[PDB]
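## tool: complex_structure
## caller: assistant
## args:
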Amino acid sequence: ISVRGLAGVENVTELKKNFNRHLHFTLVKDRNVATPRDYYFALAHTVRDHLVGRWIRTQQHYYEKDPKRIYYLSLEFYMGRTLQNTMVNLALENACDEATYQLGLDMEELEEIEEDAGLGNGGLGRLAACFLDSMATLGLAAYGYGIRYEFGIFNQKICGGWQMEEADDWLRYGNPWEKARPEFTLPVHFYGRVEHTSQGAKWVDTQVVLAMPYDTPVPGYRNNVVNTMRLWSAKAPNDFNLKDFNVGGYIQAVLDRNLAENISRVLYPNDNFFEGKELRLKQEYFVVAATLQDIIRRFKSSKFGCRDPVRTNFDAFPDKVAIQLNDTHPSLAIPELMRVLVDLERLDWDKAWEVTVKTCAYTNHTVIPEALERWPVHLLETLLPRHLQIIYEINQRFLNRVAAAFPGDVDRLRRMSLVEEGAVKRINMAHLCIAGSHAVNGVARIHSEILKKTIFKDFYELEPHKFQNKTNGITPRRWLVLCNPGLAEIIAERIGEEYISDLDQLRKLLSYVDDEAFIRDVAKVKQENKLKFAAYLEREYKVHINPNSLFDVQVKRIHEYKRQLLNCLHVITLYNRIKKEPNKFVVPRTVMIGGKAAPGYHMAKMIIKLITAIGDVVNHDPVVGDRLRVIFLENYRVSLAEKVIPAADLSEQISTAGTEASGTGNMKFMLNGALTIGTMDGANVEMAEEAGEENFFIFGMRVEDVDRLDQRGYNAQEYYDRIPELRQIIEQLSSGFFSPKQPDLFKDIVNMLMHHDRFKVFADYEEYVKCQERVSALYKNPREWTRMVIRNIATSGKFSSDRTIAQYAREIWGVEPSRQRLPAPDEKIP
Amino acid sequence: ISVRGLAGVENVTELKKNFNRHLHFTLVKDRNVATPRDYYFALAHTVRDHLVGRWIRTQQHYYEKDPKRIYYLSLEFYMGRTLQNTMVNLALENACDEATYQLGLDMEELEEIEEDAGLGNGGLGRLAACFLDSMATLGLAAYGYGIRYEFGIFNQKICGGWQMEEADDWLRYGNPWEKARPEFTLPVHFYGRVEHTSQGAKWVDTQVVLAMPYDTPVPGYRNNVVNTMRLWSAKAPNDFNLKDFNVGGYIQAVLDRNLAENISRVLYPNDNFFEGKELRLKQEYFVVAATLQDIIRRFKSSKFGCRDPVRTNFDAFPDKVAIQLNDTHPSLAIPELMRVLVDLERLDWDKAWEVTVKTCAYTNHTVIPEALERWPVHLLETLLPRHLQIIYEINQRFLNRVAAAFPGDVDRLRRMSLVEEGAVKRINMAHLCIAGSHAVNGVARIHSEILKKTIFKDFYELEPHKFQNKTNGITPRRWLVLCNPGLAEIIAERIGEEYISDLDQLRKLLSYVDDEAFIRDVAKVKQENKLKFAAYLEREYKVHINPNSLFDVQVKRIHEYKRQLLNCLHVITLYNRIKKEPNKFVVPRTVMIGGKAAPGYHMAKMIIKLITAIGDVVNHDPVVGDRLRVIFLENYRVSLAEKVIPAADLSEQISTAGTEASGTGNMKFMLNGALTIGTMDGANVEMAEEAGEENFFIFGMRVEDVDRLDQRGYNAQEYYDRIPELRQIIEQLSSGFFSPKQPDLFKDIVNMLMHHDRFKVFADYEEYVKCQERVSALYKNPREWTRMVIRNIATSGKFSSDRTIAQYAREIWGVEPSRQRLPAPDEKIP
Ligand SMILES: CC(=O)NN1C(=O)N[C@@]2(O[C@H](CO)[C@@H](O)[C@H](O)[C@H]2O)C1=O
Ligand SMILES: CC(=O)NN1C(=O)N[C@@]2(O[C@H](CO)[C@@H](O)[C@H](O)[C@H]2O)C1=O
Ligand SMILES: *Cc1c(COP(=O)(O)O)cnc(C)c1O
Ligand SMILES: *Cc1c(COP(=O)(O)O)cnc(C)c1O
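## result:
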């Protein structure tokens, strides 16, 4: 059937009876009233059963051996569905497929019932998910720590071409994967005030919110290792949240509990954008405070909570603990670790600081200013008074370091301060992270250089040793084996299976680049993938596409820097040329654009309306026929990505050079047989560098060109004046060609494009359509297109998160990865 | 060990492995980190497993056979713990005891970990719970329908002698008994307006709240029948509760969902008291609306949703459906059933009314005015506009009936109206229930007569056939076998086990009233019970009592009509007499008073303070010694009741004649070997009548005396003037003898007692202490005390809820009870 494992005689039988056990005992249903949803749960529970054994021995193991622990703090974990992934990592896929088949059910139909764990916005969140899978696969004693939002990223609905947001109640029917652990609930403080008494400061009169943990298993790939992702939930204490007496109402007091519990209710839907709301800040301290207590408790037991030097010496803390900050969201971990060490454990400042810096590491994910976290001092002042004091003190000592290093450089001092003066005083969380971490890293080579040359230049000069780079990656498991079994199979037919946990081995595929059978196969799976997607489209969304055309897709969050607008310009261009010479041949294309817009991002929502507007016109022009279709992919999410990417021919990664830190969708497309048209931005550089620029469609300005243009000054009128095709499009928008009933509908877009385009869309237009013409040319030659594809796939190995994690492990965490199978799952009950 | 069933070889082994299965697979724990709480859950899950099989066949059965269905609507279901009860009803107690023993655990210690299902306030709620158990035991196709509050009755804490309320988070660690059924979620409407168009009215522009059901199994006693208790939970729709667009905030919209969900958040903590809050009304319509849809859906399938006359003829509705209104809380069911039938199903008014009246029955539980539900019209007008219109129409036609029956009786008309004029117009829900039900019943013989003679006199004259009586009862299972296995065993040693489901058989115990062994035994278990309670006291609450003294206990909600104050007066009297003649012998007593006070009931909270105040004085007077102890039982609840009642010697049921509708705690004490000192109130009358007045300690005014006094006019001064002992107590309170630091602390109590005692406490004082002297006398003669006890126990049979239910079934529901074992639980998988 494929190498989804063995469909053993004993195990298929075993599976079936346990499926029935759960349907009866767990779901309390009988075959006569069971629905597909019930069947999905029975299976999920059956599958989950297989990894609890491993989960328990894994955790027990780490307790015995006591290795250094890696704590990945992130406010986002974009998990997606977990049934299939679990089957894949446990080699249960074929057996489950067989068993369910024998039970007269279609496993695939059941898999579609699982709701996505959308606890993330996009890149940053998905990265964390890929990392977890890699850390488990590499045998690291790692823990993912975050917030259990009961409402993840909103579900996107298109009404009249506009985006409509609606709550994502992903827990509505329950989550069979998580395990509530109310017995490990912890208290988290807010507000209050600071008392300075005799031997130390005291955080007093605080409001208490409780943090209840929920553990979700994270299985490594076929190595019997199952790590843990701990998500915190906010709960109100039953005392003060009722006991602070003297009138108010008993009922009201109870109803008001949903005020402390609002902390974990919903994820903020922003991308590369910072919103300074109090609820956000609360979420940030909540996950940090709870997590740290858990970390220290585990440390206090270790082998120190037995003997060792005997005396809670935190000197070994860094040798046993490593906490990675996914961006600045969990940045309060730094001053919080200090608070605990100094205020509670009573360590001297300097010893505490040494420990803190030595255990913390910070990862930066962007360089655009509006994304940078700068919290107003009055907010920190009210909500976390002691943390502010600690920050000021950290700042004080850091600046003194600077002054001593750069005597007299007074401007440098203000530039480097963690405190920003002006309208309102703010705290620069990024500066905080740099100062309190022993390593700072970018997510792509160019992005990392930009940090050193630009944004954090002063810090780099101060401590050059801190700055590193760790190019992002993706998990071959979910992003290949899971979503594209067809491709994985044919690759395995030639080079084996070892590449799934050693993606570098894909290079061996280079020697089949001239293989006639392989070329035919690679081309076949892609055709099968396109057919399946084209079907799904009519199935769940309804209104036909042509599977023979070129599948041109751009899927990612909607943003000005991502330039979906540039994609738009090209689409309109294709349309106008066809209308000009109707009876001239052109390579057919289905351009698919999908992505979510943050609710408050007006422009982004305007662009979504533009895309659908273009489709309204283009898709109903008889002269166009089936040569050009514009489709907006609704509710783009992980599960949807697993469907489009394998069916994509052309991948669009066209952000303005210097704006996309790295990107990861680009890597997803490369490993799945799509060709890339993009700019020298983020990881695109490393990808083209790995496959060879001849096998990549690069175009547009490089970072240097962008800066040159800025010196000069960007004037869009120029481009408008010299390119008639561009002018024609702009006047079509301006006159209502795409919005008849509301002719001025797109005035904001045009206005922006002509007068305040921060991402110089026009500057890259000419080179973009020219480049687009080259891909159309190559598509006309199936054999050569496919051969170029094989060159990309065979050369994507470097982009697996296993590689990324191995680097973090060795160069930052100080731990050694291991592909050693944990001692089976085998029963055991001590 | 006892007749808690057989500890079979095969089953104890089977139990043990499943206990381990759950500990591992369900709790995901290993023996090395498992805590008593974990062990409790493993067991609960193991036990629950045994009744899912029966649960499924029971429900399937009713579907096949299709009998008349009984729907018990109540806003309260005081369930308590359910682990033991389930073991008892399934004959699993000894086997589980053995198995856990072999696993090296103490079952009793684990049982104490289970949280109480406190979804009730007191009598009314517990009645519903006893009823459910009886309906299952009698094989009735019955369903308990209510609201799943996430916060039940508050947990009571005594601080400085005052009551402190704190949220009852009973779901904190999960509820292994319930089964969420999100697939059966239903919509419930609120607000909106009424449109009158061509063919009918339309309830329009309503706000939608969703009702998610949660099913809990209700096992009959050893008959393999497992009925269902369906509790509704409020959930917000993800559309409009987000989709009603045009600014507000996406985050805020999501956080505001906890506004529609507040409907099922907390139970109102009132007793015999009506609070006209909107949230209450919402809760009332919520349970009614959701339940009815479920009822009709089930009806539409039946055997009509196949064939029958073919044409949704609701003429058979009453032959297939019976809905019992537990008080007026679910009274909206009447106008709602009309709305659906008329507005949606399109039946003519008259045919709809005939059906409604024929399927509804109303149970009244009190006669005090402040407890009567009278909803302001402006509230119904805003929240349920169409229901108001229907009510007005019902009223219109009903009054026309009256006018025709009593021509010219204009005052009768206003008296009988469902609409009350005055300050604000209100709707008399009780009048509504009488008009729309075919039967109205009281809960005790005297209470039922009072209804006919007083409160509902006019209605009785109009339709004498509607009024009936159904004396309350209690379940011998929980209230005997479960809480007093010792007593149940010795009874069984003589007369067998058949009495557990046929309590009348207890009469046979009469022939052992002179049996020397029995007398010794009955006396022994009570001594053992007292020792165990005396221990528990020091264990969990701490500060000694004497097990040889007379256990004088009064446990029930704190209320003025319950007269805990009268009990107080007596206690102080005993104290004063001892202080007068220290070296005179008196029978030692431990008087225990426990009960919760509604948060807003100032007087009731003042009484709690008085009781603790008396104990402060009495318990620390050296001259008193161990002859008199005053203890306030904290957080009185079902699980606590199961502990005190079996250890009680004297039961206090001293409400002012005519105020306690029935009472059920009184019955609990009688069946557990306690003697009763009380007034001729509620079921006390029937109890004394059943055991013989010679075996009961009756005292005080009868109903007639109370009325005589009211004609005359009640003047407490008189009693104060003629009884020196009474005067002495009042001046002690007034002068601060019991409250030194705050001398005027009890001015409200004294003031009330002297000037506004609605329950003439003083009028019954003399006859009360005199009577108390007679019980002390009899306690001095162990052999005769015990013989009187045997007379009560042997004669309590009539007070089992099986009897009550059998009567409801035959005289109101029109169904025949059956003690037929359902065809085993045996596997089966169709
Ligand atoms: C999470 C999100 O929507 N935005 N988002 C960021 O703010 N930073 C992002 O991080 C990812 C992962 O490191 C980068 O690949 C991406 O280029 C960067 O924009 C990213 O995707
Ligand atoms: C529920 C509650 O606390 N109060 N409460 C009532 O309002 N009515 C009550 O109903 C029960 C059960 O029918 C009666 O026995 C009791 O006498 C009556 O007061 C009762 O106990
Ligand atoms: C991989 C992924 C992303 C990242 O896409 P980019 O093109 O790097 O912005 C975002 N959303 C989902 C659903 C993803 O799978
Ligand atoms: C039985 C019971 C009641 C009823 O007691 P009464 O004396 O009838 O008011 C109230 N609360 C609990 C906990 C009960 O068990």
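## assistant note: Chain A touches chain B through 56 residues (CB under 8 Å). The domain at 1-473+801-824 of chain A is CATH 3.40.50.2000 (Rossmann fold). Handing back to user.
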